[PDB]
């Protein structure tokens with residue numbers, strides 16, 4: 001894993017779930033933050049905006 005990609009579920013062959021839900025990436029894409037733990041959901045890119053930080057994992 002490297003810089004942010006939305007990887008098709010098809011290609012990825014890898015870590016399945018976003019760290020935030022401890023739930024699954026699966027709705028459409030695979031997301032990564034190489035910066036931080038590096039796997040996301042679509043819920044998860046949004047996760048931060050009110051409740052957290054600019055990114056979730058980054059702290």
Ligand SMILES: [Zn+2]
Nearest residue numbers: 018021041044
């Ligand atoms: Zn999630």
Ligand SMILES: [Zn+2]
Nearest residue numbers: 033036055058
């Ligand atoms: Zn991050």
